[PDB]
Amino acid sequence: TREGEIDIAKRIEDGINQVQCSVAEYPEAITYLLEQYDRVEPELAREKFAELRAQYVVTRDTIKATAQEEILKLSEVFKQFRLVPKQFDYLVNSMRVMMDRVRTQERLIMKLCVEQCKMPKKNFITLFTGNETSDTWFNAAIAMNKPWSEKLHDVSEEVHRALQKLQQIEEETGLTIEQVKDINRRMSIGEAKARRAKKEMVEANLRLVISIAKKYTNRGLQFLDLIQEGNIGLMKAVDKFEYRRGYKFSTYATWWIRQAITRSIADQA
Amino acid sequence: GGMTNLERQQILTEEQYLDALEEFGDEFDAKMGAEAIQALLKSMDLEQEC
Amino acid sequence: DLRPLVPLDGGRFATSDLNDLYRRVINRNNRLKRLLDLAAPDIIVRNEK
Amino acid sequence: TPEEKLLRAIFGEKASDVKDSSLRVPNGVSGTVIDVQVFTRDGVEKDKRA
Amino acid sequence: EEFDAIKIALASPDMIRSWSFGEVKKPETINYRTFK
RNA sequence: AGACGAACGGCGCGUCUUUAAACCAUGCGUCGGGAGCGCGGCGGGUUCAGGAUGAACGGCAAUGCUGCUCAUUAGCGAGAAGUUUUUUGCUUUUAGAAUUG
DNA sequence: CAATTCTAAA
Numbered sequence: 001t002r003e004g005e006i007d008i009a010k011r012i013e014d015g016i017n018q019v020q021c022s023v024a025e026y027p028e029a030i031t032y033l034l035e036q037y038d039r040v041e042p043e044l045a046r047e048k049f050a051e052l053r054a055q056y057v058v059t060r061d062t063i064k065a066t067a068q069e070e071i072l073k074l075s076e077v078f079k080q081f082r083l084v085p086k087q088f089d090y091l092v093n094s095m096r097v098m099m100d101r102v103r104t105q106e107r108l109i110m111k112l113c114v115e116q117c118k119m120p121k122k123n124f125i126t127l128f129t130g131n132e133t134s135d136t137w138f139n140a141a142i143a144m145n146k147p148w149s150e151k152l153h154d155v156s157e158e159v160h161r162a163l164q165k166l167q168q169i170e171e172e173t174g175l176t177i178e179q180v181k182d183i184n185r186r187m188s189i190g191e192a193k194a195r196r197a198k199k200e201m202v203e204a205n206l207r208l209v210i211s212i213a214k215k216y217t218n219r220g221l222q223f224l225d226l227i228q229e230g231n232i233g234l235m236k237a238v239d240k241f242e243y244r245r246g247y248k249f250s251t252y253a254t255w256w257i258r259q260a261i262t263r264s265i266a267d268q269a
Numbered sequence: 270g271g272m273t274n275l276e277r278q279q280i281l282t283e284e285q286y287l288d289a290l291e292e293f294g295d296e297f298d299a300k301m302g303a304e305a306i307q308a309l310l311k312s313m314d315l316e317q318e319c
Numbered sequence: 320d321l322r323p324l325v326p327l328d329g330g331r332f333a334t335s336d337l338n339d340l341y342r343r344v345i346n347r348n349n350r351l352k353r354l355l356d357l358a359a360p361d362i363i364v365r366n367e368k
Numbered sequence: 369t370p371e372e373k374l375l376r377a378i379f380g381e382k383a384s385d386v387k388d389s390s391l392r393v394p395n396g397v398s399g400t401v402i403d404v405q406v407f408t409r410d411g412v413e414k415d416k417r418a
Numbered sequence: 419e420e421f422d423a424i425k426i427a428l429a430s431p432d433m434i435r436s437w438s439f440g441e442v443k444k445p446e447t448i449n450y451r452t453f454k
Numbered sequence: 455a456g457a458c459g460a461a462c463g464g465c466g467c468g469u470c471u472u473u474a475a476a477c478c479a480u481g482c483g484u485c486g487g488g489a490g491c492g493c494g495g496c497g498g499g500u501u502c503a504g505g506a507u508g509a510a511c512g513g514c515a516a517u518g519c520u521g522c523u524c525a526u527u528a529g530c531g532a533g534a535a536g537u538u539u540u541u542u543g544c545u546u547u548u549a550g551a552a553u554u555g
Numbered sequence: 556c557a558a559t560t561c562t563a564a565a
């Protein structure tokens with residue numbers, strides 16, 4: 001089923017492209033990237049990094065319009081770099097930690113709406129969504145004096161300073177919380193298809209891994225140990241899987257499976 | 270569930286889960302097993318609901 | 320002592336059943352510990368749990 | 369000792385030791401033995417009393 | 419110890435660690451050469 | 455005939471022969487330490503530093519050392535032998551029949 | 556429903 005794996009690979013490339021684009025769209029991710037590059041501190045790499053610096057300064061000088069086409073051409077000129085596993089994972093980790101903080105802010109704010117006043121979900125979704133920073137939810141909610149709009153002054157003040165803490169975190173980020181949630185939605189979208197990719201890979205590849213593992217049945221080691229050890233070996237083999245090979249799938253598994261089973265029987269048997 | 274039209278109690282099995290995952294990775298907090306139910310019990314508050 | 324295992328002759332025993340049950344539970348818990356050590360994939364830990 | 373009970377479960381060869389479980393009259397029962405009656409399974413050496 | 423009433427309730431994990439004296443690790447029981 | 459087997463000893467027993475090893479792995483089997491406090495301290499852990507090991511440590515702690523003073527066990531029932539040793543010890547439940555008050 | 560026999564199935 002070469003279609004599944006080739007789709008998974010190209011779409012993983014798409015997902016990492018999208019999150020890198022969001023990083024280019026996000027200030028402090030770029031500050032972290034340049035900080036760690038300076039800490040690590042090839043002429044092609046050096047001139048590419050000089051181009052990155054020039055791009056960063058010109059884009060941050062031109063925040064005011066053409067910045068959309070500007071970040072588009074930043075996206076196409078920023079994708080020439082191959083992503084190291086550790087570095088990419090760490091940058092993704094930091095920016096998802098930002099995402100977790102923003103999620104915590106979201107969490108805190110809608111506890112201040114949902115249960116304390118038994119807010120209807122549909123009405124809150126329709127009304128609150130869209131602005132997130134205005135009086136459209138602070139003292140416009142009291143405006144219509146609907147049955148869920150009289151016991152909000154008692155909580156509007158904690159909503160208040162919670163959201164000023166939220167805007168403090170906003171200037172900590174730099175681009176308005178609407179924009180931040182949009183880009184976070186974009187990266188989460190790409191990551192969602194990435195997880196679907198690995199999901200499809202494992203679910204379709206279950207049959208292949210059990211089929212290759214079934215070759216051994218009289219080792220004396222449990223059929224269970226066979227399957228999980230073979231599976232883990234095949235997964236770490238697939239983690240850098242190449243579709244360019246003309247060889248079939250089982251060819252790219254026998255040695256890893258064999259060594260994993262050998263270690264298993266040697267250790268616990 | 271958060272601001273994603275998700276209900277705290279609705280149960281969605283594997284294939285609807287795949288669909289929802291594609292709809293949303295975040296704000297659909299996919300937890301499974303005892304841990305899931307355990308976490309849920311922590312969220313619920315008694316006296317207000319009481 | 321509440322679940323004694325009489326040594327009557329070798330491995331065979333006159334015992335309360337619980338030795339077996341504890342043995343099984345400890346085995347499976349150790350196995351799950353191994354999985355979480357090795358970062359195996361989802362469905363395997365699904366079967367484990 | 370060790371290596372013996374293991375051998376005991378493996379094949380088993382016990383020392384020719386002796387224990388006695390004769391039939392004693394249950395206590396508080398006087399008597400006067402008026403008859404004895406012996407049964408032997410076919411194909412065994414008999415006894416003088418038989 | 420000469421008590422006067424029994425209270426029953428659920429056992430918090432801290433209590434479960436309070437009662438015991440140390441974690442139990444291996445499924446093995448005895449030496450099987452000795453009975454130690 | 456002696457040696458070693460987590461500290462000492464007795465005995466058991468594995469191996470070796472003037473040597474302390476080896477085997478094994480909560481590093482073998484089994485009995486014993488009239489006394490409590492004191493002295494230091496085998497053994498075994500903690501902290502630190504060194505870069506694969508050195509130092510310090512006292513909760514505790516062995517073989518020992520100078521001292522102060524609190525006084526001597528045992529399941530049950532059968533059985534054996536000579537105040538002393540020694541053997542043994544239950545498939546009980548589930549029903550059914552007859553008979554008591 | 557307290558024993559007292561005997562039998563039979565694990």
Ligand SMILES: [Mg+2]
Nearest residue numbers: 553554555557
């Ligand atoms: Mg009467």
